[PDB]
């Protein structure tokens, strides 16, 4: 359904589309994610199309986190934010709309930005028997 | 904020009990008790670091390699919908326990208790604009 050919983001990473390059090397680009929800908004990629984060290996996945803490510091040394937020989203139902895996790196200035999380916490529906039973479904499910 | 005061190196260290998913010689991944959504898990590095400006690259890259086979095994036992990846640095930007943290939420609809508020400002920059902001993070980055 997604396939490299029709990626916006391979055709960024083959310069076929312009981009604000904040950082590249062998494995990752980052560029600045035209929308600025937050000055300085910037997206972090891999240079190999994977659809979203389940289709990552380790190594990407470890080329990817890498990186952010570098252009996360580079970010927060110009524009002194008060805080950060990192955010992905994986499938249509969660927000995603460029089926390339991408990391969001969010400066955060207070009370006016346009980056926020809805927080609900439904910790009272789960009894200390029913944590357990999630946590060893999901164990032993891991590769 | 101190390593002695952090709950996560207690976990990390046996004094306060967690929910384990999944656990190596630099990492330990634990149900979030607030579960936002079912499956909601915690991935944490075993060394206290307060946030991602803190993290070096070794020790980011030991918390991320394990993301997608953890987020891997919380869909195939609940299909979820979707799937958000999520990070707090600063009390203003939503931290309330100081030892760098990635939260996994599998989403599967309406009674989620995850959300984001997004609005785009597109409009309001040159590329001009866009080209400095680059070139001044850019040039930053040590
Ligand atoms: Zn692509
Ligand atoms: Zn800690």
């Given at each position: 359904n997604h396939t490299?050919?029709?990626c916006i983001f391979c055709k960024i990473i083959d310069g076929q589309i312009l981009c604000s390059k904040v950082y590249e090397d062998?494995?990752?680009?980052?560029?600045?994610?035209?929308?600025?929800?937050?000055?300085?908004?910037?997206?972090?990629?891999?240079?190999?199309?994977?659809?979203?984060?389940?289709?990552?290996?380790?190594?990407?996945?470890?080329?990817?986190?890498?990186?952010?803490?570098?252009?996360?510091?580079?970010?927060?040394?110009?524009?002194?934010?008060?805080?950060?937020?990192?955010?992905?989203?994986?499938?249509?139902?969660?927000?995603?709309?460029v089926f390339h895996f991408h990391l969001h790196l969010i400066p955060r200035y207070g009370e006016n930005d346009g980056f926020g999380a809805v927080w609900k916490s439904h910790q009272n529906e789960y009894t200390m028997e029913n944590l357990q039973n999630i946590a060893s479904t999901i164990a032993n499910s891991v590769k």
């Open positions: 490299a050919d029709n062998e494995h990752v680009l980052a560029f600045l994610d035209i929308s600025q929800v937050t000055k300085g908004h910037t997206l972090v990629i891999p240079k190999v199309h994977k659809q979203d984060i389940f289709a990552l290996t380790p190594e990407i996945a470890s080329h990817i986190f890498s990186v952010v803490p570098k252009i996360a510091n580079a970010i927060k040394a110009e524009f002194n934010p008060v805080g950060f937020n990192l955010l992905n989203n994986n499938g249509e139902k969660a927000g995603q709309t």
